[PDB]
């Protein structure tokens, strides 16, 4: 490698990457502000929703947070009444976490407030969607993440929509809980 | 119907996830690079910007550093109290002699084999003979942040 080419590249990725995440983070915290949840809490709820219960280990992995952060925030969610801890006989090693009825309700309620026209990443990708007929695949970015984080990490994408498709309908560009 | 709102959601959460993963990895590598110097990422970024631009206003630092203007002021002020930056008027912020030296030292220690994104991107490099353009990503960033923000890249 040319070390000057390597520098240009890594500084380009750092800048693009800070710009993208800060933008998403800001929209995500706006979304959550009426609920007094932070982003990590919502992410924990999301992971337990998507996987039908999740271990602290899966939450740390898929939430891109340390195990202790996953535990700490799950504990806070438990105190809030939004999560409960269980322990699966089949798996003595792990602590699992599951949505309570209150947590599930807050989760559905957040999804019903989801408005893509208020999301800068969605708006930012509309010219590409119109040109290509689909959302951008960002395949180079995905390739890099798969190489840094491994194949395991990537599997979260496969089930991204399973539960949501059965729980919600689209009416007027918004999600609405349907009778499942 | 333009988009399915379900597809929009899926896309949105895919972007959040990839984007957090990519930034956490860069952030972690960038903190290690800065450990011997006891500089914040935001402080290095301010130094970088003042250097690229040959002096920078607090609001240019906020914009190109992707920071609230308050944070940019706070960290510029820390850097000044370190002797790395000086406040001046043509108010703007300029590297001192010491700040320039620290900036240079850091660049001399830059080692791409310790950068996860650099290594994660070798298969692509080996396949295409160049670093990935990530042109979809760049295009989204241009639409969110504007053309003025993107000029910072045209300082290769």
Curated annotation (Swiss-Prot), chain A:
Residues 6-150 form the HTH marR-type domain. The keyword Repressor applies. Pfam families: MarR (PF01047). GO terms for biological process: negative regulation of DNA-templated transcription; regulation of DNA-templated transcription; response to stress; sporulation resulting in formation of a cellular spore. Keywords: DNA-binding, Repressor, Sporulation, Transcription, Transcription regulation. It comes from the Bacteria. Residues 56-79 bind DNA. Induction: Negatively regulated by the Mrp homolog protein SalA and by SenS. SMART domains: HTH_MARR. Homodimer. Interacts with SinR. This is DNA-binding transcriptional repressor ScoC. It comes from Bacillus subtilis (strain 168). The lineage of its organism: Bacteria, Bacillati, Bacillota, Bacilli, Bacillales.
